[PDB]
Amino acid sequence: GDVEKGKKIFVQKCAQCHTVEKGGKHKTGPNLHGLFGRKTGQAPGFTYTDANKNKGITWKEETLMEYLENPKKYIPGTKMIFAGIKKKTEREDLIAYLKKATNE
Ligand code: HEC
């Protein structure tokens, strides 16, 4: 995935909900800083749902891949927004940014 397109995709998709950076405020989507290398039900003083915690998986790209195209598929009690990103290309680009961004 391209990091630059990934960056722009995140900004064009998620931005006013998630931050993926150090200082990211709570809002609706938790500041996903430290996503890659953590489990679901492990949010830094953010109010979780009985769906995210129940999952008990890791985030590393694989799970994310489906989740982002199939939010209402992993668990039908989350928030269930748009269909999915665009296709896999953009999504992969997204992951590529995310890998960096969430780390730093
Ligand atoms: C608010 C309007 C959101 C938008 C837009 C996006 N996400 Fe989100 N996301 C949001 C919340 C509140 C949560 C936490 C738990 C829940 O069940 O709702 C999440 C969670 C994720 C996760 C999993 C992290 C975890 O909780 O363990 C990922 C990987 C994720 N979100 C990615 C993501 C991306 C890339 C988005 C744009 C394509 C996106 N989210 C939009 C809230 C919101």
UniProtKB/Swiss-Prot annotation:
Gene Ontology MF annotations: electron transfer activity; heme binding; identical protein binding; lipid binding; metal ion binding
N6-succinyllysine PTM sites in chain numbering: 55, 72
Gene Ontology process terms (BP): apoptotic signaling pathway; cytochrome c-heme linkage; mitochondrial electron transport, cytochrome c to oxygen; mitochondrial electron transport, ubiquinol to cytochrome c
InterPro entries listed in its UniProt record: Cyt_c-like_dom, Cyt_c-like_dom_sf, Cyt_c_1A/1B
Binding site for heme c: 14, 17-18, 80
Main localization, broad class: mitochondrion
Paired cysteines (S-S): none
Coiled coil start-end: none
This protein's UniProt keywords: Acetylation, Apoptosis, Electron transport, Heme, Iron, Metal-binding, Mitochondrion, Phosphoprotein, Respiratory chain, Transport
Residues the record lists as N6-acetyllysine modifications: 72, 99
Phosphotyrosine PTM positions: 48, 97
UniProt modification remark: Binds 1 heme c group covalently per subunit. Phosphorylation at Tyr-48 and Tyr-97 both reduce by half the turnover in the reaction with cytochrome c oxidase, down-regulating mitochondrial respiration.
Superkingdom, taxonomy of origin: Eukaryota
A Pfam family matched in the record: Cytochrom_C
Similarity field: Belongs to the cytochrome c family.
Function: Electron carrier protein. The oxidized form of the cytochrome c heme group can accept an electron from the heme group of the cytochrome c1 subunit of cytochrome reductase. Cytochrome c then transfers this electron to the cytochrome oxidase complex, the final protein carrier in the mitochondrial electron-transport chain.
Other known facts: Mules and hinnies are heterozygous, having equal amount of horse and donkey cytochromes c.
Name of the protein this chain belongs to: Cytochrome c
Organism the protein comes from: Equus caballus (Horse)
